[PDB]
Amino acid sequence: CSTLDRIIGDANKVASRGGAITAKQAQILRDNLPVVQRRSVFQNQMARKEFVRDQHYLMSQWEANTGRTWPTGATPHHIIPLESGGANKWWNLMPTHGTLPNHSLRKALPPGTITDLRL
Amino acid sequence: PHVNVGTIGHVDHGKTTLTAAITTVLAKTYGGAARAFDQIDNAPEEKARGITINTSHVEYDTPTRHYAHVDCPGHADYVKNMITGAAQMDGAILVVAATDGPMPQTREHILLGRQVGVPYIIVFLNKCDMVDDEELLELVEMEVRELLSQYDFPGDDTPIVRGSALKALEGDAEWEAKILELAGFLDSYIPEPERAIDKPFLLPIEDVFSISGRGTVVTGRVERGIIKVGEEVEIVGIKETQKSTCTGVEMFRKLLDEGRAGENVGVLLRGIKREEIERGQVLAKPGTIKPHTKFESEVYILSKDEGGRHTPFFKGYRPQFYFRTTDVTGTIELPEGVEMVMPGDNIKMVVTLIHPIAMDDGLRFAIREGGRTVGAGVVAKVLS
Amino acid sequence: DFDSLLQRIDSSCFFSRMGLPDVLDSRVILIENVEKVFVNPTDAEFKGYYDSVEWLPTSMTQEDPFYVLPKELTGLRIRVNKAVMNATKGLSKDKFNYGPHDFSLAARNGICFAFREYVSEQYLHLGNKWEEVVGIYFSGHWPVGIAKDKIVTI
Numbered sequence: 001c002s003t004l005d006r007i008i009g010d011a012n013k014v015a016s017r018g019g020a021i022t023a024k025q026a027q028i029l030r031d032n033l034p035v036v037q038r039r040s041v042f043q044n045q046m047a048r049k050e051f052v053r054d055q056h057y058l059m060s061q062w063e064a065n066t067g068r069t070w071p072t073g074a075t076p077h078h079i080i081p082l083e084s085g086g087a088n089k090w091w092n093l094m095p096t097h098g099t100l101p102n103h104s105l106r107k108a109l110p111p112g113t114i115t116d117l118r119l
Numbered sequence: 120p121h122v123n124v125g126t127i128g129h130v131d132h133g134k135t136t137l138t139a140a141i142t143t144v145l146a147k148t149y150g151g152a153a154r155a156f157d158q159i160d161n162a163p164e165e166k167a168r169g170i171t172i173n174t175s176h177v178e179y180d181t182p183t184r185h186y187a188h189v190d191c192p193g194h195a196d197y198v199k200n201m202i203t204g205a206a207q208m209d210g211a212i213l214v215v216a217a218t219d220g221p222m223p224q225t226r227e228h229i230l231l232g233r234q235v236g237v238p239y240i241i242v243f244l245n246k247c248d249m250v251d252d253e254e255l256l257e258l259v260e261m262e263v264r265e266l267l268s269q270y271d272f273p274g275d276d277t278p279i280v281r282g283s284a285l286k287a288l289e290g291d292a293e294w295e296a297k298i299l300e301l302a303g304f305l306d307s308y309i310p311e312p313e314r315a316i317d318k319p320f321l322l323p324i325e326d327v328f329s330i331s332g333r334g335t336v337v338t339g340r341v342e343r344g345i346i347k348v349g350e351e352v353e354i355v356g357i358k359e360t361q362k363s364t365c366t367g368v369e370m371f372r373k374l375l376d377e378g379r380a381g382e383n384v385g386v387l388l389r390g391i392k393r394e395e396i397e398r399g400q401v402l403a404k405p406g407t408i409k410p411h412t413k414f415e416s417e418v419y420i421l422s423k424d425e426g427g428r429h430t431p432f433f434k435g436y437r438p439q440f441y442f443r444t445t446d447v448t449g450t451i452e453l454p455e456g457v458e459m460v461m462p463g464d465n466i467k468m469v470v471t472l473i474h475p476i477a478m479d480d481g482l483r484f485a486i487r488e489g490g491r492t493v494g495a496g497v498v499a500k501v502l503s
Numbered sequence: 504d505f506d507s508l509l510q511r512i513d514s515s516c517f518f519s520r521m522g523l524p525d526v527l528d529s530r531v532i533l534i535e536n537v538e539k540v541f542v543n544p545t546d547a548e549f550k551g552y553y554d555s556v557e558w559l560p561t562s563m564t565q566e567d568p569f570y571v572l573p574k575e576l577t578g579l580r581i582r583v584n585k586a587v588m589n590a591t592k593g594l595s596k597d598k599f600n601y602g603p604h605d606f607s608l609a610a611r612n613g614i615c616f617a618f619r620e621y622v623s624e625q626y627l628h629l630g631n632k633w634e635e636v637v638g639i640y641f642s643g644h645w646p647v648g649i650a651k652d653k654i655v656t657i
């Protein structure tokens with residue numbers, strides 16, 4: 001299994017009822033962000049600031065691209081974390097109950113590390 | 120005066136916000152129609168050869184030019200559109216966030232840019248509203264210039280605009296001048312697209328006959344240029360390039376002085392016989408196009424959903440390469456540490472045809488199996 | 504003096520002795536490869552220092568872990584950055600990769616950062632912290648971390 005297969009599998013164990021990462025989402029995840037670059041504190045604060053602004057828009061786009069209602073009280077969770085070089089896009093979101101902490105599949109990798117998620 | 124352009128770079132760097140900003144700032148300054156982020160971001164699906172590509176087409180106008188601009192949500196879309204997409208980009212706007220700096224899709228979109236034959240790249244360094252220190256902006260510009268020059272783009276001479284797509288779109292007159300600056304560089308930096316009529320003569324051969332008493336005639340559409348009666352012409356293709364002279368140009372029984380680009384004509388030749396014309400050969404202006412057997416390509420292999428292969432192929436894959444009029448066989452060579460190509464992949468691929476075809480860098484082709492398309496490619500570098 | 508810095512950068516062999524067992528200083532803690540620093544580290548190889556190690560910056564957006572720059576200095580930073588970038592082209596990523604990870608961009612940003620701040624260090628007379636680090640880069644290695652008085656390097 002790829003590092004991404006592990007990320008999607010771990011995320012589906014936590015997914016809110018009716019918020020699973022569908023096979024279609026997983027295909028779009030792999031195609032649109034195969035390779036990521038670890039972010040700095042500053043850069044991650046910048047990506048988090050943009051997400052907070054567009055949260056409601058991105059959640060509505062998740063609802064439209066997966067054909068599912070957003071689960072009541074579910075928190076928008078980043079499948080690829082923003083700090084790992086994740087994206088603020090519907091296909092990188094998944095409903096979770098409560099804000100769960102994030103990581104990546106020991107010290108954090110230095111900013112600028114390139115991780116090919118297909119390997 | 121019409122120019123194809125579009126926005127490239129990593130997810131979240133501001134391609135769509137910029138596209139949105141350009142339309143509003145140009146509409147406000149010179150006239151035209153503002154386009155919202157929503158309508159651009161939520162791109163509809165295109166289907167060329169059963170390939171799905173999520174693509175927004177905006178139009179905007181500068182005083183001297185009309186722009187057709189493509190913007191896509193995902194990397195996936197850009198890979199397909201550069202390799203396969205209908206309109207080839209006359210120039211691209213690389214959007215780089217001053218926050219993140221170049222990321223893997225910043226480097227990928229420059230690499231594929233070279234491979235596909237995108238002739239010019241201009242740079243919008245975005246989110247400068249969030250990055251106060253100039254040295255950081257200066258060092259990010261230097262990161263980009265060296266990344267550009269790494270793939271043979273003139274990094275030193277590249278126009279790079281420091282701006283903010285969000286603040287320009289929000290109506291802040293400070294950041295609006297940066298969008299006019301950028302559009303200015305579209306007008307100044309990208310030359311007028313080289314028109315087909317003015318290019319050296321080329322006619323793919325689609326049929327051949329021998330007319331009563333008059334000799335050999337080859338039919339086809341003129342892709343580019345003009346062939347006048349009594350001009351030299353070469354037959355480049357499956358065999359040693361053959362030298363002949365056009366003795367006539369008839370279009371449905373009516374004789375002509377010239378056969379022009381876009382027209383279907385019969386081209387009467389001198390000396391050459393009916394049996395010396397072959398499938399896939401072209402008429403071409405002498406010494407302007409050359410025969411090639413081996414070349415480097417970038418290819419996209421269709422997924423199963425797009426009516427492609429269900430299974431992966433290996434180094435021993437021996438498909439049909441359709442260039443213009445007919446298929447030609449070839450063995451492939453995969454890049455290092457790669458021994459497998461899944462449906463819906465895109466790899467660099469070195470191809471050796473069992474006989475040659477007239478080609479330059481940038482020629483588009485299809486990989487096929489028993490009639491049906493399974494891939495779409497572009498010649499990155501002719502060899503041999 | 505900055506001119507003879509450019510010359511020494513222009514004649515350097517950056518990252519050329521990674522994993523190799525050169526002499527080196529006392530603070531240095533040599534680790535064999537990127538795998539055993541970033542991916543599968545052992546406290547034995549770190550000599551008990553793993554818990555204190557903090558990666559030296561690998562991004563121009565990171566803060567200086569040791570210490571308004573005179574616009575004269577600012578320019579000296581632009582010019583030493585360009586020169587360090589000239590000396591770090593086309594690096595074999597084989598030595599900077601393990602499994603899915605590639606550290607060559609982290610390394611290049613890291614060597615650029617260390618030399619910019621070394622220039623701020625010697626211009627302003629702040630101290631010797633970056634001088635320690637830049638000396639290891641000139642010896643042909645990558646100082647990747649700092650653990651108390653020690654410097655983890657490949």
Ligand SMILES: Nc1nc2c(ncn2[C@@H]2O[C@H](COP(=O)(O)OP(=O)(O)O)[C@@H](O)[C@H]2O)c(=O)[nH]1
Pocket residue numbers: 050051053054088128129130131132133134135136137192245246247248249282283284285286
């Ligand atoms: N602060 C700031 N945010 C920006 C700027 N440009 C884009 N963004 C934000 O970046 C995020 C993604 O922008 P988008 O155009 O969708 O990026 P794309 O995926 O490359 O098309 C959104 O939150 C935008 O608000 C900018 O100039 N300043």
Ligand SMILES: [Mg+2]
Pocket residue numbers: 134135160190191192193
């Ligand atoms: Mg977009």
